[PDB]
Structure formats: C-alpha cells, structure tokens
C-alpha cells in the first residue's frame, strides 16, 4: 500500500518552470569574498550550526552581521546560499551581502545586512493585539514570497524572526533548513524545532510542502495570543503529537492518518489515547484577553490543522479578517 502521495495546493510547479541552476544547488559554485574586509566586533549569538557576530566592513564602514558556520555538508551550505540569493530583496527576507572563508580555519562565513533585534523584554510586555497582527502580516509577506519562489523555510519560530520595533521592521532569518518544493519529493522529517514541528513530521509523512510553514506560524500565533511559550510543550517528539492531540483532538488525527494511509509507530498507539478537540476559550485568561478576539481564533483554527492540505495558504492568511486593519492602515 504505502502512504498516499500529496502535492501542494499552490506554487506547485514553480521550480519546474525555472532553469535547473535555480534549484539544482549542488551545481552552485561559490565565489569567496575577502575575509579581510570585515573585522568582528562582538558575538551576538550561538546556535548549534553557527555563531553570529556584529562586525564592520572596513571598505565602507557599514555595520554588518557575520554568521560563521560550523562544519556542514557543502551541499547544505550551497543550499543556504542559493536560497538566500534566490530570495534576496524579497519582502522581509534577510539580505546576504557577502560570503567569506577564513584563509586558515576554512570555516565559511555568511555576511548579512545589519538588522537590530529589540530585546524580548521591551517586546513581549508591550506588544498589543495590533502589533501582533502587524508582525504576523509581515511574516506572511515573507512566507508567501518564499513559497511563491518555490522554497519552504522549514524552521519558522520566534528565534528566526527578528523585530526592529523602533523602525517597525521584520526579517525572516536562518535559512539553513529551507529547501525547494518539488511535486513528488519525499523530504526529511526531523527538521524544525520540536514545539513547531507539524504533524506530518511527527508521523513520518515525508511528502510535505510549504504548508509545513503555516503550522509553525500557527504555533507562534498561539503562544503569542495565549501567552503560553511554547504552546505545544512536548517532552519528546512523540509526546509533542500528544500535546497537539490533547488540543485538536484524536478524532481528526486518525482521520488524517487514514486519508493518507500513514503507518504510525506502534509506540504512538499506546500514548495518544482518546481526546476531544478543545475550544480555544480554555486558554483565555484575564492576562491575555486583550490579544484574543473571534477573528484571532478563526485565523488560528484555520492554520492549526493536522491535514497539511487544509491549512490556510500564506495568501489566504493575509486576506483573513484578522488583518483587515493592518491592510487598511498600510494604504
Ligand atoms: C543563533 O541566533 C542567536 O543567538 C540569536 N540571533 C537573533 C535572534 C533573535 C530572536 C528574535 N525573537 C524575537 C521575536 C520574534 C517574533 C515574535 C512574534 C511572534 C508572533 C507574533 C508577533 C511577533 C516576537 Cl514577540 C519576538 S542573533 O544571533 O542575535 C542574530 C542577529 C542578527 C542576525 N542577522 C542575520 S542572522 C542574525 C542572528
């Protein structure tokens, strides 16, 4: 039998209609810029595959961020660089400015345009319904753009969204897990961070697509409006699907595995159990009411859905009533 195949409801054949070099990144030659142009100022972060530094380009004296990579397969470095190049100049997409090798350490280093990230202290406590609507709109601009350019990000989460609230700016970053959509293709499922993995990942359904991104956007929206970070708080990959099941109910889950004839690790059968889909109102309190609205919950419900094929698209999301004010305040 085997799993039932799936296509993407949108942007399906986008990459097919492009020159192979667009998506066949293994093909891609990298021209190394001059590592002496940049001097590193201070470390900004550390993140498993990369370290990040603020640095200055002594050619012209512009501030800049350098991401020094830890060893990864060249094919994956190529992949990140091609996607960044393909996406450069796109809405709220980080801008890759240069690529440099240390002459000795041989570690590759991506250089980006400087963007400031306002502290999560000043942010979280002062956001308000409006600001969240705004920035969710900004994220959807990026997701619709990358999806329309045949790319799925595969690691949407707070840590990969930078907000410069002084200048009401937002950038979607860390494209090192993004990959190109191709109809037919079975992809690796152990991608994204645990709280944001869609159910397709958790059940080992590999023929997924851009729709994966929309699940994690939902996971973000959820923890913002209910102020519950992370929203689905699983202790391991299995229990993660249990946390979801405990909100979205087990009935819709099994319908999903049936529709796509997915083989569930017998392990899950003894852990999922029987659960009702919960109404959103039991996550609402006094402390968070001000972010929760009928439109917020309609929007959220239409992202957080086991069946990838039935989640909103990025465009659909942008057209939802939840954003009616941000689309008018921007015209
Ligand atoms: C390894 O990474 C780190 O150590 C942290 N980095 C930056 C990440 C900062 C975390 C951003 N979280 C803020 C955030 C994001 C989204 C929301 C939001 C969610 C739902 C609705 C509306 C908003 C919120 Cl509240 C906060 S970082 O290293 O310094 C850094 C800085 C600049 C830069 N430029 C290109 S890559 C890069 C990396």
**Nearest 5 degrees, angle CA 116-CA 60-CA 110?**
55
Range of the domain at 155: 6-23+115-331
Pairing state between β 161-164 and 169-172: antiparallel
Of 63, 82, 114, the residue that ends a domain is 114
127 and 168 together in one domain: yes
d(CA 156, ligand 1 centre) in Å: 11
> Does residue 28 belong to any structural domain of this protein?
yes
| Closest residue by CA, ligand 1 atom 1 | 47
45 is in an annotated binding site: yes
Which residue, among 103, 92, 104, 68, has the nearest Cα to 176 in the 3D structure? 68
SS (H, E, C) the chain: CCCCCCCCCCCCCCCCCCCHHHHCHHHCCCCCECCCCEEEEEEEEECCCEEEEEEEECCCCEEEEEEEECCCCHHHHHHHHHHHHHHCCCCCECCEEEEEECCCCCCEEEEEECCCCCCHHHHHCCCHHHHHHHHHHHHHHHHHHHHHCCEECCCCCHHHEEEEHHHCEEEECCCCCCEECCCCCCCCCCCCCHHHCCHHHHCCCCCCCCHHHHHHHHHHHHHHHCCCCCCCCCCCHHHHHHHHHHHHCHHHHHHHHHHCCCCCCHHHHHHHCCCCECCHHHHCCCCCHHHCCHHHHHHHHCCCCCCHHHCCCHHHHHHCHHHHHHHHCCC
Which residue, among 174, 153, 172, has the nearest Cα to 163 in the 3D structure? 172
- The values of phi and psi at residue 209, to 5°, are -165, -165
Structure tokens at 53: 């530094």
Catalytic residue at 155?
Answer: yes
260 and 245 together in one domain: yes
Nearest-atom number in ligand 1 for the CA of 132 is 22
Residue 109's DSSP bridge partners are 68, 100
CA distance 308 to 205: 10
> Does residue 1 belong to any structural domain of this protein?
no
124 and 167 together in one domain: yes
Structure determined by? X-ray
| Residues 191, 197, 198, 203, CA torsion sign | positive
| Closest residue by CA, ligand 1 atom 37 | 52
d(CA 86, ligand 1 centre) in Å: 22
Are 275 and 252 within 8 A, CB to CB? Answer: no
Catalytic member of 98, 129, 144, 155: 155
HSE of 112, CA atoms in CB hemisphere, 13 A? 25
Report residues whose beta carbon is within 6 angstroms of any ligand 1 atom.
44-47, 52, 65, 67, 94, 112, 115, 117, 120, 123-124, 127, 132, 135-136, 158-159, 161-163, 173, 220, 224
Residue 108's DSSP bridge partners are 101
| Closest residue by CA, ligand 1 atom 26 | 158
CA distance 317 to 313: 6
HSE of 330, CA atoms in CB hemisphere, 13 A? 13
């Amino acid at each position: 039998s085997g799993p039932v195949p799936s296509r993407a409801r949108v942007y399906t054949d986008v990459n097919t209609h492009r020159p192979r070099e667009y998506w066949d990144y293994e093909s891609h030659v990298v021209e190394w810029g001059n590592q002496d142009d940049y001097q590193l100022v201070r470390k900004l972060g550390r993140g498993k595959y990369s370290e990040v530094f603020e640095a200055i380009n002594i050619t012209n004296n512009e501030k800049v961020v350098v991401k020094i990579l830890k060893p990864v397969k060249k094919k994956k470095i190529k992949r990140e660089i091609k996607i960044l190049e393909n996406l450069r100049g796109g809405p709220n997409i980080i801008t890759l400015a240069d690529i440099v090798k240390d002459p000795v350490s041989r570690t590759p280093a991506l250089v980006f345009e400087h963007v400031n990230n306002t502290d999560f202290k000043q942010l979280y406590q002062t956001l308000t319904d409006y600001d969240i609507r705004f920035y969710m709109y900004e994220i959807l601009k990026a997701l619709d753009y990358c999806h329309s350019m045949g790319i799925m990000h595969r690691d949407v989460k707070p840590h990969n969204v930078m907000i410069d609230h002084e200048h009401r700016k937002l950038r979607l970053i860390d494209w090192g897990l993004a990959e190109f959509y191709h109809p037919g293709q079975e992809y690796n499922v152990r991608v994204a961070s645990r709280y944001f993995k869609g159910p397709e990942l958790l059940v080992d359904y590999q023929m997924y697509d851009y729709s994966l991104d929309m699940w994690s956007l939902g996971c973000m929206l959820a923890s913002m409006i209910f102020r519950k970070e992370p929203f689905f708080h699983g202790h391991d990959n299995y229990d993660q699907l249990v946390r979801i099941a405990k909100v979205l109910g087990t009935e819709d889950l099994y319908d999903y595995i049936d529709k796509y004839n997915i083989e569930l690790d017998p392990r899950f059968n003894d852990i999922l159990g029987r659960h009702s889909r919960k109404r959103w109102e039991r996550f609402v309190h006094s402390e968070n009411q001000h972010l929760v609205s009928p439109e917020a919950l309609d929007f959220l419900d239409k992202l957080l859905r086991y069946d990838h094929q039935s989640r909103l698209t990025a465009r659909e999301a942008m057209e939802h009533p939840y954003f009616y004010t941000v689309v008018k305040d921007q015209a």
